[PDB]
Ligand binder design. Sequence first.
Ligand SMILES: *[C@@H]1O[C@H](CO)[C@@H](O[C@@H]2O[C@H](CO)[C@@H](O[C@@H]3O[C@H](CO[C@H]4O[C@H](CO)[C@@H](O)[C@H](O)[C@@H]4O)[C@@H](O)[C@H](O[C@@H]4O[C@H](CO)[C@@H](O)[C@H](O[C@@H]5O[C@H](CO)[C@@H](O)[C@H](O)[C@@H]5O)[C@@H]4O)[C@@H]3O)[C@H](O)[C@H]2NC(C)=O)[C@H](O)[C@H]1NC(C)=O
Ligand SMILES: *[C@@H]1O[C@H](CO)[C@@H](O[C@@H]2O[C@H](CO)[C@@H](O[C@@H]3O[C@H](CO)[C@@H](O)[C@H](O[C@H]4O[C@H](CO)[C@@H](O)[C@H](O)[C@@H]4O[C@@H]4O[C@H](CO)[C@@H](O)[C@H](O)[C@@H]4O)[C@@H]3O)[C@H](O)[C@H]2NC(C)=O)[C@H](O)[C@H]1NC(C)=O
Lengths: 668, 669
Amino acid sequence: EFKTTPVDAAFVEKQKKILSLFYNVNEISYEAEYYKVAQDFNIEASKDCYTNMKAYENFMMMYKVGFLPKNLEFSIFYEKMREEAIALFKLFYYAKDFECFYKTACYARVYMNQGMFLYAYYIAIIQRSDTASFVLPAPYEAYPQYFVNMEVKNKMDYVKMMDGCLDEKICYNYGIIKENEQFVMYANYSNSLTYPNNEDRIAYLTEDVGLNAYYYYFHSHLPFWWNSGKYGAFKERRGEIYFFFYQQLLARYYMERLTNGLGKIPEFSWYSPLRTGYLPPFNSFYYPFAQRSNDYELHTEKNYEEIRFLDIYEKTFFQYLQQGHFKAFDKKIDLHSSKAVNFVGNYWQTNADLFEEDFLQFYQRSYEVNARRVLGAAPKPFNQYTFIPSALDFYQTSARDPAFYQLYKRIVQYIIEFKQYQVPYTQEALHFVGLKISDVKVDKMVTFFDHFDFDAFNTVYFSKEELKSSPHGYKVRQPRLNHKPFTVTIDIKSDVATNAVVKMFLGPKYDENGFPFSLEDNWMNFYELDWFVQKVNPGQSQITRSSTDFAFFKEDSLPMAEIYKLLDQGKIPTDMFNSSDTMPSRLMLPKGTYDGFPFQLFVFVYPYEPTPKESEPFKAVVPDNKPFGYPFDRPVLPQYFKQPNMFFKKVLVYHEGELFPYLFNIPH
Amino acid sequence: TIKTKNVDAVFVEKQKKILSFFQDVSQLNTDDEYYKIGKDYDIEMNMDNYTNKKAVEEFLKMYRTGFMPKNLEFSVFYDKMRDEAIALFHLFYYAKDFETFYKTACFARVHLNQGQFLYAFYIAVIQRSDCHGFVVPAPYEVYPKMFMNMEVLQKIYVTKMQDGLINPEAAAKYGIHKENDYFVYKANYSNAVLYNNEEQRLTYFTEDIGMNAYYYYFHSHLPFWWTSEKYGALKERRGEVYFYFYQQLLARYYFERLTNGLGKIPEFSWYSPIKTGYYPLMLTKFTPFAQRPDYYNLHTEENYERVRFLDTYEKTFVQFLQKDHFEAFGQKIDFHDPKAINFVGNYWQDNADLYGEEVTKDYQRSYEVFARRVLGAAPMPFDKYTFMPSAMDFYQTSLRDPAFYQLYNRIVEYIVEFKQYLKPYTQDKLYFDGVKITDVKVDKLTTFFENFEFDASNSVYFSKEEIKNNHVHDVKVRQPRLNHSPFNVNIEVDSNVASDAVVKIFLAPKYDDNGIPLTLEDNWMKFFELDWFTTKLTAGQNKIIRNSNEFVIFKEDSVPMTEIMKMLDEGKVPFDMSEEFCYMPKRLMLPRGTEGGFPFQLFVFVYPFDNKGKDLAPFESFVLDNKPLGFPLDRPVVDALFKVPNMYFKDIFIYHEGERFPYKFNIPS
Ligand SMILES: *[C@@H]1O[C@H](CO)[C@@H](O[C@@H]2O[C@H](CO)[C@@H](O[C@@H]3O[C@H](CO[C@H]4O[C@H](CO)[C@@H](O)[C@H](O)[C@@H]4O)[C@@H](O)[C@H](O[C@@H]4O[C@H](CO)[C@@H](O)[C@H](O[C@@H]5O[C@H](CO)[C@@H](O)[C@H](O)[C@@H]5O)[C@@H]4O)[C@@H]3O)[C@H](O)[C@H]2NC(C)=O)[C@H](O)[C@H]1NC(C)=O
Ligand SMILES: *[C@@H]1O[C@H](CO)[C@@H](O[C@@H]2O[C@H](CO)[C@@H](O[C@@H]3O[C@H](CO)[C@@H](O)[C@H](O[C@H]4O[C@H](CO)[C@@H](O)[C@H](O)[C@@H]4O[C@@H]4O[C@H](CO)[C@@H](O)[C@H](O)[C@@H]4O)[C@@H]3O)[C@H](O)[C@H]2NC(C)=O)[C@H](O)[C@H]1NC(C)=O
């Protein structure tokens, strides 16, 4: 069913050790392995478990003081917590070998705030080169409270308090059933009480567990606060990735907007009311998540300083552009080079690369952090360890808030204003001399919703006795967007046998009006679907390529239950190991219409130039010296896009079955 | 295929005379008979030719002070202009007989303002009992300036100045063709050139020449400023008609919103800015129409006085609501009485019947008049005769403005509030003893666009020679309009006892924007009436078939006045122009479908046609029933106490064929 990889026994021991810190994250089991190891791990007397004496002794300074206590909300966006998280990450990452890393994690798993631990631990598994290939459970299994709406969470809690079902038939009518002595709780996406506006049409994409997790993975693969020295040659292209990642996401999101009749992502002002509100159905130990009403005035007393910070952060960018020959933080940088694109993305992110340092420093203030605090609408932190959460406080929940897409669309618009200074590609740079795409055909592209399970066991609490047996079996089931596999068929005539790159993009055909888009106005609204190297023959030849093979999408994560079962076969899911940071397959297509929703497919073929071997942080970084998003990485002169080796096809996206997800969660 | 009807040479003569006034409307053929009559006609001398001594003298006192001059724009929303229009109306209406009427109009055509004349003439013909049965051409043929953008108009103007085309093939590129001795101009809706908000999705509806012409007919059949005493039975029902007309219009419009993915009509405040602007592309020979930018602050200095008026007008009503029972306007009104709907509607239209008078007076300030002015965004009028027009100074253009629908949504909603005082019908009143609907079946419902032409000749000025030789009809405008295929409705009913029955057909949405099914409790006012009729039931099972083109509430397109001349030569007139003047055009019956098929519901009601104790035959051949208009959806419903064996809700889907977008019809290749 799913791609597997054979895996050896030494691997199985280690993967098991890793996965085991993810069970009942909210409680300590006094008789699990990890607790004994933690009791036995003398942090004081193990300087020699670490590569780096400075990292170690830094941790100890903080530790002898004290860290964020257990059970409070952790967010990387508050300074003191970040600095604690980073100290923990350093320890994890400079652990001499796996056993030392294991012991430290056990230690932290017992003695530290669980959000803080989980955050550094994910990040550590991904970055340590001895853990590179190891698999993680999906964030929704690790943090189910950020992915379950309140309604469902309370239903789960009440079945635990009752220790099961009064009678099946009552519970069935509340969407609660038993399968194989496991509880299944049916969950709707939220109604207009949480999206009090049109943005509620889109709840099935914005609340999707895959899409939210996607963003979390993205953050974990290269956190803003860390340099990218780990990845060598890639360092010089970090800011490029930032733009590309957000341009792609907004392209995807606009496409969902279009199929639900919704139009452009709205623009705002720090000095004006923001139109579209959001009321999160989440809560922390102390606080329900902050709500932002409709027409929320951004410019109130408590935001005045933050807004002045944000306002000048943007205008500083404008001043660079006005000046052409800019220069922040050491060098003079020219706008027509690419040292430039690097700078641009880093600038908007305030990442560690901007300042050319290893880790972000306590006093270095982020644009994104301050925007997130203003848009999140929360009252100010009570003390440094206690803030009032909003959706924008976490990567697991950010994509739920319409303001998220508005903030990032603004940043993307600014970056695009810079792209006006880049030289557009000429005819000769885009022409594949001697080669011509003569036709493109596609299978029916069809979307539908179907059910989806995950274990939400991590936010139910369990007794001392039950913990001895690491208990799960509280499953949430959700209708989720999906599509049928299709094939793309490309017809090629060339003069000569050569290696080629084939790329595919999906973009809109018509605006909200019903007018055709021009390339000049639409290049930013295409997202990449696939990338691959093909060996062409001389003459007439034919390339077929299934959607299940598209380079940039993954299969669904498996639950840990399945992971252990596969592990017992020496098997592992390829997609969870080789590409967690990639968008889920089921969301590759925006919801269609029974009708057939008009979009367009761009197939581009250009020569393969042999670029040697790396090991970069995302699967978006493909073995090619070309810009990411190439040839749609910058403004376009439309007269150059009628190259024989390019082809635009109208495709229609259909939908099958029920149009509305709630029709799948109705009892009788 | 035009529903015809036969006529005698006396009719044709009168009819040709009536029609003569609509030719070359902005000019005088000093050769035509209408001129000779008009020039010399002495009104004082003819006082004995009028039913009303003082209406003649009132007129002649007005006429000696002077009337609105030629060429300036007329609108009935301004005091002095209205009063002259009414003064002239009376003169027309009290003419002894046709001869007198005709000579009077000749005078008015030669000497009075043309929009003033036409406005009064039009109404006179609908109102004079000796003119019932006569035909008037389409308002778009009469005021083509009002039914088309600047772009077409300028092309038309350019062609007349050059006296033809310098380059046939360059003209073709501009949507300008010569067919026969006609110039045909293709025309787009305004969204093909302007997309300033989402409301531009709906310009094939709001700019539809049929829909706009419809509203002008409605106004002309019963002006707010005139009593309805002449319509007998309708007098105690005037308010209900007013509500019903807007309620219907707004349900229809809302449907166009849903299929274009736009949801509820937005609410506004007199104290806040309003979101959606309007940017008229229409030209006045003297001026440009006023623009309302987006986020127009209604409450600026120039409106402080008008808004204090609108607010009290509204609040007085909120006070009536709170009071339940009260004496207003010299009448004790009770809100639990359903008949109070008469007063309610009258109050919002500030019509003459509110005061129980023949004609409204200047000091009876109208709410609608002042809402239209406020929302129109015009600067203050220069003087009594000189204003900056907006879409909302004219019945012909009002539907073009999104703010129009918001205004009347506002008023309708306040009326809905009063409706909450009415007891919902019980089982007992709705239940047809021994009758049951077992099935309803519908033919595919499909929409599509097809081209439509009209004579735009009145927008153009002809030379003395052309006026003589009567080559004055040569300009046609071609524009895609919405339409639909004919479809049948099969009703299968069981009844044990034979008897007469009324069959009613209603159309409604099926889901809100969240895609939750419409409950009746909330959504009874979003039902649009398609058809009213009677049949004979027999014991056993019957099949009732009804075609969409037998639907009583809709009419066929008017024919151009040129074709009416052709027909009058055979002794014929098109039926739907004569007694079905003021119904909505059939082509606009259904909202534009989607290609996958948009979900609606069809509601079918069957109830006994007992006798006809009281039936409407005065203004409208409409409610031949003792039943409220929109019966049984004229008041709030209870889902549970509502459904009975003789009602059927059927799920229906509205398709669309061919091009989705009008502009696709105007591409040259
Ligand atoms: C109702 O509301 C009130 C007020 O909000 C709230 O009171 C607060 O309770 C918390 C704890 O629940 C209090 O915090 C504790 O305070 C003591 C002493 O605090 C003072 O002394 C410190 C040093 O002497 C000084 O530095 C402080 O600034 C302060 O003046 C602390 O000792 C407590 O323990 C720490 O807690 C952390 C664990 O989460 C650790 O960082 C820390 O280190 C650890 O400790 C062990 C020894 O136990 C050591 O061996 C390890 O090395 C380990 O790292 C230590 O355990 C704790 O901070 C807070 O002060 C109260 N507020 C006020 C204003 O008095 C009530 O609790 C609320 N009640 C309810 C029912 O909700
Ligand atoms: C209603 O609204 C719709 C939508 O707005 C209008 O539809 C538009 O109609 C346009 C024509 O008026 C059409 O533009 C043409 O597109 C075709 C197809 O690509 C081109 O062939 C045309 O280009 C010719 O004219 C240009 C300038 O006018 C020249 O620059 C160009 O050279 C070309 O001329 C020809 O090409 C040769 C050059 O090598 C030349 O030698 C030869 O002799 C030719 O003359 C136009 O660009 C729009 O594309 C179309 N819009 C859409 C979205 O479809 C419609 O016109 C409006 N209708 C009315 C009645 O107002």
